[PDB]
Structure formats: C-alpha cells, structure tokens
Amino acid sequence: IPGYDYGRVEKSPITDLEFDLLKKTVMLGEKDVMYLKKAGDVLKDQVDEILDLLVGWRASNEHLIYYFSNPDTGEPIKEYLERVRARFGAWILDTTSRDYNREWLDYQYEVGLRHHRSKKGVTDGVRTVPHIPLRYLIAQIYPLTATIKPFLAKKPEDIEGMYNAWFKSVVLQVAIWSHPYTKENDW
Amino acid sequence: IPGYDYGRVEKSPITDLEFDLLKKTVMLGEKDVMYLKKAGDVLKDQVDEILDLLVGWRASNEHLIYYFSNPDTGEPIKEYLERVRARFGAWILDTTSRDYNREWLDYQYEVGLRHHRSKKGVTDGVRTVPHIPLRYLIAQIYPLTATIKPFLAKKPEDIEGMYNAWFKSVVLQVAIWSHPYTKENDW
C-alpha cells in the first residue's frame, strides 16, 4: 500500500501520558480494546464493501470529494482517490487490530498531518487542495462512526461494544489530529 | 440562570453557509431536527439525573474537575460548578428543542469561547484554569454523546434517531468550538 507508513513515522510531539489521558477522556479501556479486535474479525473481509461508501473512484464521496480534487480546476484526482482508498482501507483494520501504543499514536498524528496543509498531497505527489478545514475533520467524526455500525451487525452488546469502541477511536485520533491545526498552547 | 445568554450573544465569525454546510457534513437533517425535538420531550424531566452525571458539586468528572477548579490550589469551585450545571441543564434542552439557526450557532460559539481562554471563568467571575485544551473538547464528544442513550430509552429506531441526532449535535457543536482554538486559516 503506497504511502502507508505505519511503523515508519516520526515521534509525534504528544507525550505518551498525554496520549494515555486522551484514551481515558474517550473512555477507551481494555473492554474496548477487545471489542475493537472483535470488530476487526468482523470487518476484515467487508473492507471493500465499507470503502464503496467512503472513498474511491467507484465509491461515492460527498461534497468532501473536493478535497480529493485539484483546487484550480475542481477535478477529482483518481490516483489521489485510489491511493487514499487503499490506505484508508488498511486503516479500518488498523483501528480495530492494532494496539493503541506509541507507534499507533504516531501514525494517527501522521494521518492528521496528511489532512493538514503540512503534508496533504505530499504522500501521493498530487497537487490538490492544500488543507482540510479542522471543522470538517471534527464534523466527519459522526458519519465515519455511523457508517460502521451496520457492518458490525453480522454473526446487541457485541455490536454496541464494537460500535462504541470504534466511536471512541474515531474521536480519539481526530483529537490528536487537531494539534497541527491548533495554536501552540491551545491543543 | 446567570450567564446563560442564548439569544443575547454576539455574531460568531462563522457565516450562515459555513454553518449550513457544517450541519450537512454532520448529516443533521430535518429527520434529526424532529428526533432532537422529540428527544426534548424525552429529556425534559430527566435533566437533573443527567446533570448529576456530568456537572455539579455532587457530580464526578475525573480530572475534568480540574478545569472546574482553581489552578493554584486545584480546588473545585462550588459556585463555578453550580452555575455551569444550571447552564448545562439548559443546554440539554437547547440541544433538543431549539432550532439550529444563527441565534443557535452564535450561542454555540459562545459556549466554545467559554471553554477557550478567551472567556473561561469570565462568565462567572471565577478565577479558574484559564483554558480547556481542545483535545479534551473533541475527546468529550464520545462521553457526552454516549451518556444520553440510557436516558432516551422510554418516553429502537426512535431512540436510535434521537441518539444519532444528539451525536450529530455534540459533534457539530465542537466543530464550531474549535474555531477560537484553531489557527487562523486552519478551521
């Protein structure tokens, strides 16, 4: 998966304790860590069927596809959409299967930088919209949590446990992603 | 309710369209407006049992009480916790019953400034922790969304509709709150 740099990212300027307290604010506990790995066993094979709702040339993508497009021409960039689709398709399983350690925290900071003007488009060598407004990143917290709920419904509390933990993770990384957008001592 | 200024706040530096498309990014539609206004009939009488979960002199909030406390002594301020609890009790019904128009958006921007160092503690004349880090504001999206689900039970899809719409409201409220925190051109 080109551009996918899980395990090759630099040390995010967020301390492990600060990260530990973010997972606590979102109430991400051992029960959720288990439920996440349970959703990973549930969603590993439906990844492509999840993706067709979220990103791709044959998926859908709402008006947010503009940030997948050339800003001068408003032209959706296909390989931009294809390479992010693959990276995003792997992130679904990384959100469920990977341990939320420093290497996870550092990669989430990577994903946050890739939405920021600090690195957007650089991963794919694409000339695109330079920066995604933080308001939409936070606004995206809901749809990208609610889309997964029908998927974990395969084979109550299991579907609620897997749902809440993903909800917790979808919040948690965006809370990390805010730091590049946020003023120095404001994050 | 002292300091409660819904309808008395200044114009947020967010345009109506920017707000209107923020409401779409969170997918808050007329069906949610109904479920929200339906949730108001569900939550109007359980406010005290919700408030005691989230804010109060007899409510617990982990390290979140620190931001309700004096920074020099770490001592929770009673008048701070009671005056915000009342305002929070009104926001529960404002989240459900009030129309999400400009007058609504401006007060949400007010609540965000009251978490920011721009206005925190000023509303209540209290000397407190000057600023709440945005990372916890976003992290708080989950707990303050997930607590409402058990209350919305009495008076499936109805409680799912009210819950998702509440989730949508908690997210959309935080995205506006980020603007005072977010760097100039990053929100």
Side-chain angles (χ1 to χ4, degrees), chain A residues 63-64 67 131-142 174 178 181, chain B residues 13-15 17-23 25-26 134 138 171-179 182-187:
Chain A
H63 104 276
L64 312 150
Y67 302 94
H131 159 275
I132 292 144
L134 177 60
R135 93 194 77 141
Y136 298 126
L137 293 201
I138 299 177
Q140 205 49 228
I141 280 160
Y142 162 75
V174 178
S178 327
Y181 300 91
Chain B
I14 302 170
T15 77
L17 173 60
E18 276 180 70
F19 168 40
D20 207 85
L21 258 181
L22 266 159
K23 209 162 50 89
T25 318
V26 303
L134 185 69
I138 288 140
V171 159
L172 162 80
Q173 285 168 25
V174 174
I176 293 141
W177 293 5
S178 49
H179 177 275
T182 317
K183 270 141 58 68
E184 197 140 35
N185 306 119
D186 282 16
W187 182 80

Side-chain angles (χ1 to χ4, degrees), chain A residues 18 21-22 24-27 32 62-64 116-117 131-136 138-143 145-146 149 160 163-165 167-168 171 174-176 178-187, chain B residues 18 21-22 25-27 32 62-64 116-117 131-136 138-143 145-146 149 160 163-165 167-168 171-172 174-176 178-187:
Chain A
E18 276 155 0
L21 298 132
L22 275 164
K24 175 88 161 288
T25 325
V26 205
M27 305 179 48
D32 297 301
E62 304 83 19
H63 104 276
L64 312 150
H116 202 258
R117 93 191 42 231
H131 159 275
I132 292 144
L134 177 60
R135 93 194 77 141
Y136 298 126
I138 299 177
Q140 205 49 228
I141 280 160
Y142 162 75
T145 292
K149 169 93 163 250
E160 312 270 356
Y163 179 62
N164 265 345
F167 183 3
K168 288 174 215 241
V171 157
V174 178
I176 317 172
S178 327
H179 187 273
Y181 300 91
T182 319
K183 272 129 101 142
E184 255 208 50
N185 330 101
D186 280 37
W187 179 80
Chain B
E18 276 180 70
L21 258 181
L22 266 159
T25 318
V26 303
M27 328 221 299
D32 304 280
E62 246 87 343
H63 63 87
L64 304 193
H116 193 254
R117 64 263 300 271
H131 164 237
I132 294 140
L134 185 69
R135 82 198 96 149
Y136 303 131
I138 288 140
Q140 210 73 47
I141 278 156
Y142 167 81
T145 285
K149 183 62 146 313
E160 269 310 322
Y163 179 79
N164 269 262
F167 183 6
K168 288 179 211 238
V171 159
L172 162 80
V174 174
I176 293 141
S178 49
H179 177 275
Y181 302 73
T182 317
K183 270 141 58 68
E184 197 140 35
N185 306 119
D186 282 16
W187 182 80

Side-chain angles (χ1 to χ4, degrees), chain B residues 61-120:
Chain B
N61 313 69
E62 246 87 343
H63 63 87
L64 304 193
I65 319 180
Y66 158 77
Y67 304 99
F68 268 148
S69 311
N70 176 282
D72 263 352
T73 71
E75 199 168 3
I77 308 132
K78 186 218 190 111
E79 49 280 37
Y80 204 152
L81 264 143
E82 59 211 18
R83 286 160 61 88
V84 171
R85 183 196 159 104
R87 256 134 51 192
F88 199 97
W91 160 96
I92 293 171
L93 259 43
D94 285 329
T95 300
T96 63
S97 312
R98 228 81 181 260
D99 268 294
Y100 286 20
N101 42 55
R102 161 63 60 159
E103 142 164 290
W104 177 91
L105 156 76
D106 274 346
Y107 195 65
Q108 313 307 133
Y109 197 80
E110 176 74 20
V111 186
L113 282 173
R114 302 188 166 183
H115 294 67
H116 193 254
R117 64 263 300 271
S118 260
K119 302 263 268 158
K120 196 180 169 293

Side-chain angles (χ1 to χ4, degrees), chain A residues 101-154:
Chain A
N101 38 40
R102 174 48 85 136
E103 95 154 348
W104 183 83
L105 163 79
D106 275 354
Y107 192 67
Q108 306 328 65
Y109 198 89
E110 195 49 35
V111 187
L113 230 44
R114 302 185 177 199
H115 296 75
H116 202 258
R117 93 191 42 231
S118 48
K119 141 158 289 184
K120 198 171 161 332
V122 169
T123 300
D124 287 24
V126 279
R127 292 188 310 165
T128 189
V129 176
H131 159 275
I132 292 144
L134 177 60
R135 93 194 77 141
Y136 298 126
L137 293 201
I138 299 177
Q140 205 49 228
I141 280 160
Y142 162 75
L144 290 197
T145 292
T147 49
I148 294 263
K149 169 93 163 250
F151 292 125
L152 345 133
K154 51 143 265 159

Side-chain angles (χ1 to χ4, degrees), chain A residues 11-29:
Chain A
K11 173 106 165 283
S12 39
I14 295 157
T15 83
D16 322 71
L17 175 61
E18 276 155 0
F19 174 43
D20 221 29
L21 298 132
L22 275 164
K23 322 148 84 187
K24 175 88 161 288
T25 325
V26 205
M27 305 179 48
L28 181 65

